């Protein structure tokens, strides 16, 4: 997560202090930007890590993160590649003992990867009843 301290146009009677923020990638010497030049799967994994990493820096006490449909808009190869990716994070944070991760997905395929690991005791669900009022159930 790179930044520019000197992003302020000199003002005679105004501090006008705005610091530029621009995240970039590195492969060997090259440091080309990721807005483009990368596949869809690369971004979705990127965002999750930043939200993860960023949280602990400010607080370092609460491991609460809430992904939303992270697997949406992904081709077949990436979703499983994404699935194993999340698997590494939780195992890494598992030793730390501080991570309360909430993830929402409506793709039948993606969900089974995490529960198959069997570390999560159960998964919830949301349904529409005869009166179209949301209901919550617990399933193992």
């Amino acid at each position: 997560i790179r930044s520019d301290v000197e992003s302020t146009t000199s003002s005679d009677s105004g501090t006008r202090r705005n610091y530029n923020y621009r995240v970039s990638m590195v492969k060997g010497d090259t440091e080309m930007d990721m807005r483009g030049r990368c596949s869809a799967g690369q971004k979705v994994l990127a965002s999750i890590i930043i939200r993860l990493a960023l949280a602990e820096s400010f607080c370092a006490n609460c491991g609460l993160i809430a992904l939303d449909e992270p697997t949406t808009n992904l081709d077949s190869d990436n979703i499983r590649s994404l699935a194993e990716s999340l698997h590494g994070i939780i195992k890494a944070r598992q030793a730390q003992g501080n991570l309360q991760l909430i993830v929402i997905t409506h793709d039948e395929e993606f969900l089974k990867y995490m529960q198959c690991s069997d570390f999560c005791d159960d998964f919830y669900r949301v349904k529409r009843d005869e009166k179209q009022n949301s209901v919550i159930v617990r399933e193992s």
């Binding site: 960023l54 809430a66 570390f119």
Partner: protein, 194 residues
């Protein structure tokens, strides 16, 4: 640093006559639902439970309350509950309440109601406070996190899940909130009144 259990009532699609509850299990808690089944509503309530701020541009028109027409009663009461364990071993529970009235007119008025924070001490219950402005401050301190982060990081809206990968200036804007940079910039502006 942990959150224990949640309970919704009369929010968006969720019914107003029967509370719905979901409990979070360390480390991962999963939520799957068919398209347009109110999967995202759970997150919104979790946000309003902690930071006490309604979704964006949604506080008008009662966009965050089970629409009164569906139930059929001109008066609708919405309730949100949150149980959690403080940074210290103690754990509390939070509540908030909203009310919405339908007048003769199509127009409807959103009214904020009293909430509270309860102490679930061993074999005892105590009331910490009842003023939401304070409860906003109390809740943040108990969680051990400041309000800025939850606004843009911890509880991210569905569409903007990729905010770190957004337009760079749009990427810039958020950090200004995350750093809580604005409080101190206007302290400098107070030095401009000097």
């Amino acid at each position: 640093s942990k959150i224990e259990k949640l309970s919704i009532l009369g929010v968006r699609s969720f019914g107003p006559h029967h509370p719905e509850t979901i409990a979070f299990n360390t480390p991962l808690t999963l939520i799957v639902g068919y398209n347009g089944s109110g999967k995202t509503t759970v997150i919104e309530c979790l946000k309003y439970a902690t930071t006490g701020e309604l979704p964006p541009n949604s506080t008008r028109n009662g966009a965050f309350i089970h629409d009164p027409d569906l139930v059929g009663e001109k008066e609708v009461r919405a309730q949100v509950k949150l149980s959690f364990r403080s940074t210290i071993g103690e754990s509390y529970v939070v509540t908030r309440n909203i009310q919405l009235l339908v007048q003769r007119n199509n127009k409807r008025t959103q009214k904020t109601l009293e909430g509270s924070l309860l102490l679930r001490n061993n074999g005892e219950r105590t009331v910490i406070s009842t003023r939401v402005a304070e409860l906003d401050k109390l809740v943040s301190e108990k969680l051990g996190v400041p309000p800025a982060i939850l606004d843009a990081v911890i509880f991210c809206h569905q569409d903007d899940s990729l905010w770190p990968m957004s337009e760079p200036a749009a990427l810039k804007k958020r950090f200004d909130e995350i750093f809580e940079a604005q409080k101190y910039t206007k302290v400098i502006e107070n030095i401009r009144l000097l």
